Design a protein around this ligand. Structure first.
Ligand SMILES: O=C1C[C@@H]2OCC=C3CN4CC[C@]56c7ccccc7N1[C@H]5[C@H]2[C@H]3C[C@H]46
Ligand SMILES: O=C1C[C@@H]2OCC=C3CN4CC[C@]56c7ccccc7N1[C@H]5[C@H]2[C@H]3C[C@H]46
Ligand SMILES: O=C1C[C@@H]2OCC=C3CN4CC[C@]56c7ccccc7N1[C@H]5[C@H]2[C@H]3C[C@H]46
Ligand SMILES: O=C1C[C@@H]2OCC=C3CN4CC[C@]56c7ccccc7N1[C@H]5[C@H]2[C@H]3C[C@H]46
Ligand SMILES: O=C1C[C@@H]2OCC=C3CN4CC[C@]56c7ccccc7N1[C@H]5[C@H]2[C@H]3C[C@H]46
Ligand SMILES: *[C@@H]1O[C@H](CO)[C@@H](O)[C@H](O)[C@H]1NC(C)=O
Ligand SMILES: *[C@@H]1O[C@H](CO)[C@@H](O)[C@H](O)[C@H]1NC(C)=O
Ligand SMILES: *[C@@H]1O[C@H](CO)[C@@H](O)[C@H](O)[C@H]1NC(C)=O
Ligand SMILES: *[C@@H]1O[C@H](CO)[C@@H](O)[C@H](O)[C@H]1NC(C)=O
Ligand code: NA
Ligand code: NA
Ligand code: NA
Ligand code: NA
Ligand code: NA
Lengths: 206, 208, 206, 206, 212
């Protein structure tokens, strides 16, 4: 533990936290979604509730070390409060997102950070058709709330959402789940910005 | 990262935070509303629930910098915790407002701040008749909870609430939505305060 | 801005916080209620929900200054966390009081503090009869939770609850609403204690 | 104001917080309940909700002073955050307990602390028979969550719950309410630990 | 109080907290569930709610002391904020776990830590057949959220869940409940990680054994 204590001390107390990207030094965050459950549907308010975890990855030079200097430690875990995290938000949620896992991130000696918050989200979705063979499709965009595409880029590794942890006895069966990067335009600043649109097609289990 | 670290350190550690406006140095805050959804109506309690974000803009001399001394940085993002923010509140909500976005603001080199919190609001609104062609009208005033018109002025860039992100499959269709500055006076004091009145006319969604 | 900064540092950093009143320096807090809505009634649990705001006022010598020493500043606003505030509570609430306003106070150069929290309160109230012409009466006492009448006195400017912001399209119509100082007793110390009794008579709107 | 600030500084700043009891110095905590309302009953989940305040009392040498050194102050009120408080918990609650009053304690010159939190509690209770002349009985134990009887003893000043603030128009009428110290032994350890059993027999109001 | 204050000062104020385990100093955490109640079942959303506490136990050399040097104190209690705690999470919860107990741990002189948080948990469970004789079975896996099997091992003291504080008048009777260590592997990555699988077989209560 002494070497990990040194490393954490060297990375966190010896300088300020990363202040976020800039135009001069923009940042790529990769996202993927792992969908666990569609919990419920409210046809009186057109809200659907999802449970998923969201893998976020990025890389900072300020978080690199040489494993040789610290007992060959090649990665560690630390509170998400110790580091900068991207301001990724659901654009059409109808309640504050609920946090379902520990807010802890993994940091690798090359400066890669992996943060995988599990979340319960209520979002804008009209579920009319869900009690049918064809089912229903809803979507919700994830984006940095404040950064433009000059500062933050969002990427995915695959446009296919991971269903390997989807609850087999959910009330709702998944027919398709995609995560698609998109470039939007903001009129206020004239600048592009990026979202990942999560689109889920689902039906009441037969 | 270096220059941005320096800028933030210079602005936030090398002085205390803006203490808010006074009568000798008043402040103008511009507001506008981007209405996203009428989620829910409750005809048993006369409460309606709205999702929207609120664009807030103000300018402070103490937040200005010369980009040439900071690697040509012209703006940055920072947590709303690092700066003063106006105490704007819905005057007729029935629940604590829920925050739906990161509490982060954009600060520009001229000292302009833009802060755009997304919110869910339950407020006082009689939905009797919302299942009709004419729909219903409800209104909610936004104001500083503690500052009068001698310290804080509120204004809008437009009268029209922005409906470009309004949810197309909401249970409720928006018929109109306006945001209007009003000058009020508190009880018998004759002392002025300003609000922005959010008036929304809507009906149950509907040939189709 | 700098004069206000100086004032606040002089008041808050150069002395600790007011420790609360004592038998020998008791404090008077004036309360007034501004009723906004009876939001709902639950006849199966005998709980009624009110929205109001609560004007609180008190005066401390430690918060006085001379406006001429501070660029003619006569009043300022500050976070209620920066100052002492009285522990006024509804004695028969059935849920934690929910806060509907910014927790900021107004301080005037004579040492007067005004704090006006808005609140949603569930409290004990049998609404049986609300659907008639005569209506129903319910009441709730507000008091310091830990101070006696020897440390904290409560007073009202007026017996009449202010209804100038009562919602005109409330499900419930206010027939009368008073706020009346009362003196109480308690055999655990014998000391008197003060409450403001909010008495509201209402019915379903016609 | 000044004597009180000096006293509070002497007690809280000049020394750290009481760290809790030990086998060598055990601590007796007295409890007493003041039952305000049975707010509701859920027969589909066997949960009942009570509102009450719970008087907690203990005594620490470290909180003593001589009134003559502090201008004859014989007591004061302070934030419960300033002092150690016992970790008493309802052992069969079904929801986190909701705090209904300011978390402020009374400290006396002899080192006695009195802390009286108002609370709403959902707990495990089968209300079958509540609508009958006999009514129903439910119980919940209150105990230290982490201390044995070697460190903490609990007791009551009376075995009768105080009903003098019980809500007179509650849906539920109280037939008896008792509070009784009990000595338990953990599994096969022989190690004692104490609880106060709150037993309430109630029925639907005639 | 003085001997305890010294002890706490020497353990917490002279060094930082345990930073967690690493591949070269891995940690074993022991978990035990004490099931108190199945509070409700929601057949419209396939969520069930449990009340339980969860005994967690682990041992750190950095929290050891000689009782001789501290007035024979052999253990103490302290706020869970003062120490490292393991990031154990239920993997199929559908709401944030609700905390029902004070967040305080017990630390012994050998450097053992025992933290027993009382919880209400909603989790993914299809209750279809819960009204029958044989009832229904649901499962929830508990695991470190960020550590793999190279840094954290989880085990149980025994496979039977402790039912000695299960509510005698719950709406639901427990037919069995077990807590079993499992080895998983993440995706195709080949890399192990451990869970404790909480498996509860339950039915709506009926008086008598229900099969006669
Ligand atoms: O600086 C802003 C302000 C505004 O905030 C409301 C939310 C918005 C949704 N996304 C999030 C990032 C944002 C954007 C793009 C490019 C530069 C700045 C920037 N934002 C927000 C903006 C809109 C549009 C866009
Ligand atoms: O006298 C008051 C108290 C009252 O407090 C509740 C909140 C209010 C919102 N704003 C903040 C300042 C205030 C106002 C304006 C002019 C003189 C007095 C005065 N205040 C508050 C008042 C209302 C209205 C207004
Ligand atoms: O010191 C106390 C403790 C006790 O706390 C439970 C609630 C109570 C209701 N009111 C609030 C103030 C109080 C009171 C009156 C006179 C001196 C001290 C004092 N309090 C509380 C008391 C009871 C009674 C009373
Ligand atoms: O060994 C234990 C663990 C168990 O933890 C859950 C909470 C409990 C409440 N109190 C706190 C101390 C305890 C107890 C008493 C005597 C020896 C061991 C012991 N504890 C906890 C125990 C229960 C019961 C009791
Ligand atoms: O690659 C990952 C990411 C993923 O993150 C979500 C949470 C998980 C719970 N534990 C924590 C460590 C982890 C794991 C084990 C072995 C290799 C990679 C790996 N992780 C996480 C993983 C799951 C599963 C497992
Ligand atoms: C940034 O600022 C410098 C000097 O302050 C100026 O010469 C130029 O316009 C900008 N960028 C450079 C030189 O990269
Ligand atoms: C304050 O009032 C004085 C006269 O009483 C006046 O000369 C001056 O303009 C005011 N000062 C400030 C700083 O506003
Ligand atoms: C305090 O008590 C002393 C001793 O009985 C008494 O003489 C004096 O009147 C009191 N002092 C103050 C400052 O109130
Ligand atoms: C602790 O134990 C020692 C050695 O067994 C014994 O001599 C003594 O009585 C105890 N010391 C204290 C300080 O209580
Ligand atoms: Na959002
Ligand atoms: Na989880
Ligand atoms: Na408000
Ligand atoms: Na508990
Ligand atoms: Na209260």
């Amino acid at each position: 533990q002494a070497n990990l204590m040194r490393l954490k001390s060297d990375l966190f107390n010896r300088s300020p936290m990363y202040p976020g990207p800039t135009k001069d030094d923009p940042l790529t965050v990769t996202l993927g979604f792992f969908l666990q459950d569609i919990v419920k549907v409210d046809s009186s308010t057109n809200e659907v509730d999802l449970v998923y975890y969201e893998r976020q990855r990025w890389k900072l030079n300020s978080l690199m070390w040489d494993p040789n200097e610290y007992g060959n430690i090649t990665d560690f875990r630390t509170s998400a409060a110790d580091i900068w995290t991207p301001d990724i938000t659901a654009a059409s949620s109808t309640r504050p997102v609920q946090v379902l896992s520990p807010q802890i991130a993994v940091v690798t000696h090359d400066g890669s950070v992996m943060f995988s918050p599990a979340q319960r989200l209520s979002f804008m979705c009209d579920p009319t058709g869900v009690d049918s063979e064809e089912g229903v499709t809803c979507a919700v965009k994830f984006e940095s709330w404040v950064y433009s595409g000059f500062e933050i880029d969002l990427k995915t590794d695959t446009d296919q959402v991971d269903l390997s942890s989807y609850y087999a006895s959910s009330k709702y069966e998944i027919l398709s789940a995609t995560q698609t990067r998109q470039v939007q335009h903001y009129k206020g600043t004239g600048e592009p910005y990026i979202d990942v649109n999560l689109v889920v097609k689902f039906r009441e289990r037969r």
